[PDB]
Design a protein around this ligand. Structure first.
Ligand SMILES: C[C@H](CCC(=O)NCCC[N+](C)(C)CCCS(=O)(=O)[O-])[C@H]1CC[C@H]2[C@@H]3[C@H](O)C[C@@H]4C[C@H](O)CC[C@]4(C)[C@H]3C[C@H](O)[C@]12C
Ligand SMILES: C[C@H](CCC(=O)NCCC[N+](C)(C)CCCS(=O)(=O)[O-])[C@H]1CC[C@H]2[C@@H]3[C@H](O)C[C@@H]4C[C@H](O)CC[C@]4(C)[C@H]3C[C@H](O)[C@]12C
Ligand SMILES: C[C@H](CCC(=O)NCCC[N+](C)(C)CCCS(=O)(=O)[O-])[C@H]1CC[C@H]2[C@@H]3[C@H](O)C[C@@H]4C[C@H](O)CC[C@]4(C)[C@H]3C[C@H](O)[C@]12C
Ligand SMILES: C[C@H](CCC(=O)NCCC[N+](C)(C)CCCS(=O)(=O)[O-])[C@H]1CC[C@H]2[C@@H]3[C@H](O)C[C@@H]4C[C@H](O)CC[C@]4(C)[C@H]3C[C@H](O)[C@]12C
Ligand SMILES: C[C@H](CCC(=O)NCCC[N+](C)(C)CCCS(=O)(=O)[O-])[C@H]1CC[C@H]2[C@@H]3[C@H](O)C[C@@H]4C[C@H](O)CC[C@]4(C)[C@H]3C[C@H](O)[C@]12C
Ligand SMILES: C[S@@+](CC[C@H](N)C(=O)[O-])C[C@H]1O[C@@H](n2cnc3c(N)ncnc32)[C@H](O)[C@@H]1O
Ligand SMILES: C[C@@]1(C(=O)O)N[C@H](C(=O)O)CS1
Ligand code: SF4
Ligand SMILES: [Cl-]
Length: 346
């Protein structure tokens, strides 16, 4: 019964059986109680501040061929772009002028910049007195080391799926073992490290989602990015079903219950599949938002999945928009860089 699973969640009996049951029960009352629990845990542990991470998607060039992604190398129906280093630094400076306290640099796996142009960019942005987060994919340890010496603070590398068989099929250039070794390398190097997964991938089961939760719990990641799979028409998964918003929301809620002091975004993918999806997610465990700061005309070309929000507006609108969102939610903007503030437990 839902009441019993909620009691075990409240007492932190996080067995594979309790997590499977939580993901399998579809009762409205249960789901609402789960979401309330995750919202309360978020308040108690990370408070009312919603941390703003301004994301600049600086290149859509990619060497990899992930089956779900619109930027996959085999997609010829996509205009590719690269921002220049000066364009990236100035665009970061504009986000700092708008009050962003973290700059996220994200791209496909684009060899051109790696590793020294990235290091030069990172050093320039760090002079502005903000946190820098990189989300550039899988690279040699040496590249990660250089970027840390250059001043990068955090690195986002979603584990995508903890099922190694499904991982290798969806990501045929690599492996779960490679992905995990990159995450472990990043943590050893002193980055605050983000993982996370997609929900509703073709062939992914509920048991797979339980394994994603336990993986996350096992490694105690500082950040966890979770969103639905959204099929992209220029990919091999074009005709597969999109991930369910409610199930994805439950994954967010459980992540917060499992990792109470972690930083968890309300992702753009959540706001794409349901109107208002980010705001709901911020009330079910999330405490971070990532306003799109990619300038036109490139913004519209970072087509990972179709329907992406925030593309038709003036390119300086997102930061103010998320500040209004935070206020109407009765929350507060982040006062510092919003690094993880661990609460040591027993
Ligand atoms: C309480 C009022 C008025 C009911 C009435 O007509 N008086 C009704 C009118 C529209 C209803 C919402 C929508 O249904 C969307 C959604 C369906 C979910 O399933 C349950 C939650 C939610 C948000 C509903 C909640 C509530 O039920 C609302 C606000
Ligand atoms: C805003 C709506 C509908 C409220 C409503 O319309 N309910 C009838 C009127 C009730 N009022 C008290 C406003 C007046 C009562 C007098 S009356 O005579 O009208 O009935 C309520 C109904 C169910 C609520 C969500 C669930 O909890 C799950 C979850 C818990 C988290 O923690 C916060 C996030 C989330 C998503 C909640 C948000 C929000 O809160 C919802 C949508
Ligand atoms: C960039 C330009 C020109 C001047 C400039 O280059 N300004 C650098 C400010 C740098 N910081 C943000 C670090 C200041 C923090 C001071 S604070 O006292 O807020 O800590 C300035 C002039 C007016 C400023 C907006 C308004 O104000 C309203 C609103 C206040 C929010 O809050 C942040 C968002 C927003 C939209 C502001 C963004 C930006 O800023 C604007 C556009
Ligand atoms: C109205 C839209 C569908 C719009 C459409 O596409 N038509 C549907 C899709 C997902 C739904 C929410 C989620 O289930 C989570 C949560 C469950 C609680 O029980 C009641 C509140 C809440 C926020 C739901 C409200 C509403 O029902 C949503 C927004
Ligand atoms: C300029 C645009 C329009 C409006 C819409 C919502 C407004 C913000 C919120 O009101 C919350 C907060 C109130 C504080 O007082 C000062 C700062 C802050 C972040 C506001 C700044 C600015 O005023 C915003 C961005
Ligand atoms: C596009 S990549 C850029 C960063 C770096 N290339 C990497 O893969 O880590 C960022 C994330 O987008 C997500 N994503 C890609 N395609 C998606 C899709 N079709 N639907 C939902 N999310 C997707 C994946 O979870 C991936 O980690
Ligand atoms: C920035 C990112 C994340 O969760 O870190 N969100 C993106 C999105 O939801 O579109 C994909 S990767
Ligand atoms: S998910 Fe990242 S690595 Fe895979 S194709 Fe897309 S941009 Fe390239
Ligand atoms: Cl971050």
């Amino acid at each position: 019964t839902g009441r019993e699973i909620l009691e075990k969640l409240e007492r932190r009996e996080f067995t594979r059986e309790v997590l499977k049951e939580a993901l399998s029960i579809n009762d409205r009352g249960f789901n609402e109680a789960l979401f309330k629990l995750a919202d309360e845990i978020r308040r108690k542990y990370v408070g009312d501040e919603v941390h703003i991470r301004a994301i600049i998607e600086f290149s859509n060039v990619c060497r990899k061929n992930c089956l779900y992604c619109g930027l996959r190398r085999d997609n010829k129906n996509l205009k590719r772009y690269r921002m220049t280093p000066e364009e990236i630094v100035e665009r970061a400076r504009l986000a700092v002028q708008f009050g962003a306290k973290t700059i996220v640099l994200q791209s496909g796996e684009d060899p051109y910049x790696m590793p020294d142009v990235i290091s030069d960019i990172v050093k320039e942005i760090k002079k502005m007195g903000v946190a820098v987060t990189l989300s550039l994919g899988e690279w040699p340890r040496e590249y990660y080391e250089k970027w840390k010496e250059a001043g990068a603070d955090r690195y986002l590398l979603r584990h995508e799926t903890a099922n190694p068989v499904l991982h290798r099929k969806l990501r045929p250039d690599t492996s779960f073992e490679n992905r995990l070794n990159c995450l472990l390398t990043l943590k050893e190097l002193g980055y605050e490290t983000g993982a996370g997964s997609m929900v509703g991938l073709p062939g992914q089961t509920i048991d797979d989602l339980v394994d994603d939760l336990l993986f996350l719990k096992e490694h105690d990641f500082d950040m966890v990015g979770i969103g639905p799979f959204i099929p992209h028409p220029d990919t091999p998964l074009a005709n597969e079903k999109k991930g369910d918003f409610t199930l994805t929301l439950k994954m967010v809620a459980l992540t917060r219950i499992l990792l109470p002091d972690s930083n968890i975004p309300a992702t753009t993918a959540m706001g794409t599949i349901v109107p208002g999806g980010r705001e709901i997610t911020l009330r079910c465990g999330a405490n971070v938002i990532m306003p799109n700061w990619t300038p036109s005309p490139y913004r519209q070309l970072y087509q990972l999945y179709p329907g992406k929000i925030s593309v038709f507006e003036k390119d300086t609108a997102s930061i103010p928009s998320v500040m209004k969102m935070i206020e109407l939610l009765g929350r507060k903007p982040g006062r510092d860089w919003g690094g993880r503030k661990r609460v040591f437990e027993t």
